[PDB]
Symmetry: D2
Subunit: 249 residues, 4 copies
């Protein structure tokens, strides 16, 4: 019974409804943005999320992302900035997470994110300490706030509870709150509360998103080194594979 | 009769109504964001915009900006990126321009912008060619699109028509359009059409905004060189002065 | 293969997503409003709409209705108005119709409706002539506008094409248009265009809705005669039955 | 210093900004709806509201109303309903009240209202007992809820505090709450809290609005008796006069 993919109908209903919800909330979703890469399922064992559906409230790692911008911002940069340009750029995405579902534990070496809740409430789990890079000095300025301890009773995905162990800091964001920054190199994950009557909708503004995915397999590289560059490190190895392509049957 | 400032009542009605409009459109406006620096008047001779008011449709250079984010994004950066970090960072602002009014001709040496129209329509004027920097190689990737010629009959601010001479390329953006990128070092300006029944509301996502203004006079500098760093070059000298502080009587 | 009901999962995903879309558009949807009567399927042979789903674009008669108000407005009425009070009252509902789907041909003897498109576009089909009531004088004031002829290529539900024969007048309504009135005793139906990227969402403001349905089976009758009073006359007999209760398996 | 009218500029800025706010909130505001009758000032001594402006927070009786529908709903009615048709009909309006301002104490003999808060919060004051009509039996069904006592510290308009004496019941409505019904013949008034950061925006759905005002002076009467029929009874005589026409200088 363990699902190994998502049917074309399950996929379209999930993604097209999400796109409509996005438009209702005034996010600029174009036709190209609504594709077979928008709906993400993090790992083969997470396809079981569609056993009972996106409204079951069950804890699984899957989400939708509509990307309206992923600008390298390389034009006009002095040549000397070429080796550090990968830490910059501008990316705008709308993220939709259903009740109980999660964006899994991971960190980026180059990308810094910010969250703006548009609908529902966002429960963020993260590590206030950066993931030290092997022998290399890093800049510091504000660091990350310690936050609060996890509330009791958070249901985690079966077979991936341990991937959340280090994301000890917690914060619950709501529409209207100040923008929340997630510095690069910091472990983070988030979910929509299981009792939510609406999907969690969040506007993410971050630096460039290096992701040689399926729908991202067809773009000239602004800088040589950027080609094939990956910047997503999932704590769970099971969440790495299926992140770059959803199995639609 | 030439106004030299804006009365406290004229200012508050302009800025508080704009903040409410922003909230209606779901932009996360906090209390701190609604201040005496949000309403901008570009030059002493532009205060005459309040002679007949923000609904006269007359061409003047004045606008409102609510900044929800201006993150240096320096944390986690390798030390070697310190000299180029100023070209990165993340800034999120909501801009409100009334009928006939303009955000004046200017360019940034370090900041790259992107526009998302939320309400009304945006008429952008710009130069598809970058403002060459004295003896220094720059990176290139996509450059700027040539766009279209200006439509006929655009009323420019009296005494500043020449500042628009070089911004020969034109594009009209609407809600739902793809995000529009304005690369750093490119001259640009924009206005709300004079016949618009609503103020132009635009979400701007850009790299860090270096602006030692009035409300920005009180923040630790992430990197030494950033202190007192200016990154706004207005074509009109008249628009430089009053950009950093609105005279409220 | 002919579906005879809708599964609990198909129902909830359809109705809960619709409720979320409604909230995003600012319609006041309460918990009680999201129930097993909100999703309507007009006839046993229309359950096949869930063969390929609400995003197939296929022509079927099914829709969702969230009722926020159905006030008799009997309080304060002079006793003499008791026999005509049934033509008054106030009803506020949000209607959601998916691509290609229809609200089937029908007329009301007592209820007058009005439409306000919130999202998408509404294609209304109707008869500009009232359905004459057996021997009884009726008041007239504005009547209904003749409208336009049907555009070519409208796909109707298989086995119910004839029910649309008399609804010869056509009008396409969009968000922002003047409110459109549908006088009582006039045949009407409507659909969401099959090529729409979003479900059609319409705010309906009408006089009292007399409907002894499933979720409506439990309310004191303001006036004696109102008890068990029906006011929905479907052109297709097949659309009458399943209108009062959706078969959820 | 006692203002006796509102300047053309004060009026337009108030009304045009309100119309834009309405559009942002998705209310279908057409060009005709934005006129010189939309902004209402209840009495000559209330023009002082523009002494310090709509953002002063001072208690004054003035508001804006955009009417999208006022349908007699007479078509299709049996002739015998002619004498009671005036209690029916359908009216849809968007009401905008600024901080501290009020819609003054009044009751309608024929019109029953309902409120839906779209933005901000609405503080309603009313009498749970109907205004008995001289020798005439009236129907009853749900009556009005007793509500709660007034919170302490409500600032009333100077020179009109007594008009509120009988409106002893209180209820505070917010966006998302169930629709609130105000039965005909019941005294009612409401205000936007003085500390609100946004104007109060409310969708009103009611039966026909009989109002021989300024912008309403030019429509055929559906039924003979309706001609010149008035249905607004203000507790304060000072609020009656200027209700039908705003003095714009
Ligand atoms: O935190 C989430 C961000 O990394 C998103 O843009 C995706 O990469 C999550 O997989
Ligand atoms: O183009 C406009 C941007 O530069 C804004 O953030 C302001 O700096 C305009 O003065
Ligand atoms: O035209 C549609 C209205 O009658 C709705 O309230 C429902 O009764 C449609 O079945
Ligand atoms: O309660 C307010 C309603 O009566 C409105 O439509 C206006 O008539 C208020 O003057
Ligand atoms: O609307 C675009 C279509 O819908 C999405 O499911 C994409 O797969 C694309 O095929
Ligand atoms: O909410 C949709 C349905 O109800 C829930 O119980 C899930 O199991 C799913 O099948
Ligand atoms: O131990 C300090 C750092 O913070 C935690 O997130 C760990 O991953 C480690 O990299
Ligand atoms: O709501 C905040 C106040 O309104 C704005 O006018 C700011 O000046 C601040 O004083
Ligand atoms: O729109 C507001 C008023 O009308 C316009 O004519 C301007 O002059 C201003 O005074
Ligand atoms: O002449 C090429 C460049 O483009 C234009 O914008 C000028 O400012 C110049 O700097
Ligand atoms: O959220 C309320 C639940 O969802 C809807 O499916 C209703 O059936 C009700 O059971
Ligand atoms: O849009 C969802 C899927 O795609 C359409 O082709 C329908 O058949 C349905 O199965
Ligand atoms: O024939 C005139 C009327 O208009 C049409 O709608 C028919 O139903 C009939 O009742
Ligand atoms: O936009 C319509 C104009 O604005 C409002 O002030 C009305 O008076 C009308 O003249
Ligand atoms: O909010 C606008 C200004 O500030 C308030 O104090 C009022 O007096 C008005 O003049
Ligand atoms: O005294 C009962 C009624 O209720 C109150 O509102 C009074 O106006 C009176 O008409
Ligand atoms: O123990 C809780 C959770 O299971 C873990 O992953 O993070 C810390 C939290 O308190
Ligand atoms: O001449 C027009 C305008 O006055 C100038 O500033 O830019 C080019 C345009 O065609
Ligand atoms: O023939 C078309 C349609 O099939 C019918 O039901 O109504 C009139 C229209 O022109
Ligand atoms: O006394 C308060 C108010 O002044 C009066 O008008 O209504 C009752 C309330 O408690
Ligand atoms: Co991330
Ligand atoms: Co700029
Ligand atoms: Co109907
Ligand atoms: Co009233």
């Amino acid at each position: 019974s363990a699902r190994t993919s998502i049917t074309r109908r399950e996929y379209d209903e999930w993604v097209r409804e999400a796109a409509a919800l996005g438009k209702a909330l005034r996010y600029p979703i174009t036709e190209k943005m609504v594709n077979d890469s928008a709906g993400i399922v993090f790992g083969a064992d997470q396809y079981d999320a569609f056993k009972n559906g996106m409204w079951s409230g069950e804890p699984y790692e899957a989400m939708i992302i509509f990307e309206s911008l992923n600008e390298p911002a390389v034009d006009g940069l002095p040549t000397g900035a070429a080796p550090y340009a990968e830490y910059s750029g501008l990316c705008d995405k709308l993220m939709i997470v259903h009740p109980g579902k999660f964006c899994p534990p991971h960190h980026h070496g180059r990308k810094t994110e910010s969250y703006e809740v548009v609908l529902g409430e966002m429960e963020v789990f993260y590590s206030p300490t950066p993931s030290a890079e092997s022998g290399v000095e890093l800049l510091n300025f504000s660091g990350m706030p310690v936050g609060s301890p996890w509330p009791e009773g958070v249901a985690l995905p079966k077979g991936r509870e341990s991937s959340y162990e280090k994301l000890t800091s917690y914060v619950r964001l709501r529409a209207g709150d100040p923008k929340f920054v997630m510095h690069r190199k910091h472990l983070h994950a988030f979910r929509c509360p299981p009792d939510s009557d609406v999907p969690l909708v969040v506007r993410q503004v971050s630096t460039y998103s290096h992701e040689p995915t399926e729908a991202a397999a067809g773009n000239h590289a602004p800088i040589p080194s950027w080609l094939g560059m990956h910047d997503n490190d999932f704590v769970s190895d099971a969440a790495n594979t299926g992140r770059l392509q959803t199995a639609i049957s």
